[PDB]
């Protein structure tokens, strides 16, 4: 629920009616297929709030 934006260097996700940038995490996006047919695909690292928590 939102749209991928970019301020030139980093990529953020915000709603479609108000600029509220936030880190693209796993709970903000859903996985559907591989990136070989989507026209306009760009490489970007997604965050997962499970790897830093599993450090202990």
């Amino acid at each position: 629920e939102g749209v991928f934006v970019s301020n030139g260097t980093h990529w953020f996700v915000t709603q479609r009616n108000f600029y509220e940038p936030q880190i693209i995490t796993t709970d903000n996006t859903f996985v559907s297929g591989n990136c070989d047919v989507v026209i306009g695909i760009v490489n970007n690292t997604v965050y997962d709030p499970l790897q830093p928590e599993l450090d202990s």
């Binding site: 749209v3 479609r16 559907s32 297929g33 047919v37 989507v38 026209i39 306009g40």
Partner: protein
């Protein structure tokens, strides 16, 4: 507010329940169907006199 047309179509699909992956994975098919429908509209209005 400027916006790419594929993203506009993704929003339209979200407005009826369909997700964005259905459009982004079948964009060429939807574009071809839209072009064919727009082309058929002309001959449908031309041939039919009523």
């Amino acid at each position: 507010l400027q916006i790419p047309f594929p993203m506009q179509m993704a929003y339209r699909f979200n407005g009826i329940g369909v997700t964005q992956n259905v459009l982004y994975e079948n964009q060429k098919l939807i574009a071809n169907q839209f072009n064919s429908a727009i082309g058929k509209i002309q001959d449908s209005l031309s041939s039919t006199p009523s």
